[model samples]
Target: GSPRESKLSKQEGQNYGFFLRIEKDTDGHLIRVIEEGSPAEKAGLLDGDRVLRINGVFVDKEEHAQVVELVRKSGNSVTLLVLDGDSYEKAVKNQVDLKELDIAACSLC
Candidate 1:
């Protein structure tokens, strides 16, 4: 479990934070949504719902990289954020695996 209602911006490729394995399963933690295409996807992630925290420090409407390091160092999964397609339902967790993810990257020219 983690804190609650934290948010992150779209700093997609900076790598300062981390690359995780997340998805929107309405049964995860801290993490909420696995953006259709993101580093989290490339890294093989299953975005959680609750999103109670990202890089620790409890968000506080700020962006930092403690949890990111947690991911890079251990490649551990962290909770992301999400909004239901139609409702303002709170986020939750659904345990998934890196292996379960199969999104591939384009050839880097």
Candidate 2:
């Protein structure tokens, strides 16, 4: 399956409304939580989605802190490229280079 891009922004007094967790065994950053009625859910972010890029930059090799920094630096808005858990695992198993995936037509844009 193809990966999807989620564009999210936070309003005043509110957050992007999602939680990210790094899996020790896979070293992958997964979307662990999405607050009800939040921007994340509205933008189609799903739990178990593995983050491939943050704001157009590939984060597959970035440290967890660095990834978080990228999100923070995006200020009110952030763009994310993500694949569902099964797709991510299959991509890795197939040795697919996520950075090469064509995201020109953002589904959520």
Candidate 3:
């Protein structure tokens, strides 16, 4: 009940359009930032959301690197399940400080 799922996709070579940061205490990835008008934000993802799954795969127990690698391999499109106390409508109702997401270079993408 915590998470509302959203499916988002981008053209080939287009960015996933959100930023995920790793938090040691959470034991999973954190949705730290999002690009304006990007697929992520457009699909209702917001800052403070915790990523629970991707493309039907649960990643709560996975390591940071593994989760990221899978996301990268998800190719031009990806599905995300994020849990957040605040809804996306409220998140964007006010101005959110969006910063550039740090993505590690991978051979796959």
Candidate 2: where are CA atoms >4 Å away? 105-109
CA lDDT of each prediction against the hidden true structure:
0.35, 0.87, 0.69
| Candidates 2 and 3 compared by lDDT, better number | 2
lDDT (Cα, tens digit) per residue for candidate 1, span 1-109: 2223223333535432332333354232244355555555554434333333344433322333544444454333344433222222321124333222222336767
lDDT pick, better of 1 and 2: 2
Q: Write the per-residue lDDT of candidate 2 for residues 2-103, one digit (tens) a residue.
A: 789999988778898888888778747889889998999999998889888998899978888999999989999999998988988888899988779755
Instruction: State in Å the error of residue 43, model 1.
Output: 1.0
Error of 3 at 73 (Å): 1.3
Clashing pairs in 3: none
| Candidate 2 backbone collisions, by pair | none
Which portions of model 1 show Cα errors greater than 4 Å? 1-29, 49-109
Worst 10 residues of 2 by lDDT: 100-109
Worst 10 residues of 1 by lDDT: 83-92
Best by lDDT: 2
**For residues 22-102, what per-residue lDDT tens digits would candidate 3 score against the true structure?**
755443477877898788878988777867678877776588888899898998888887767364224335553212111
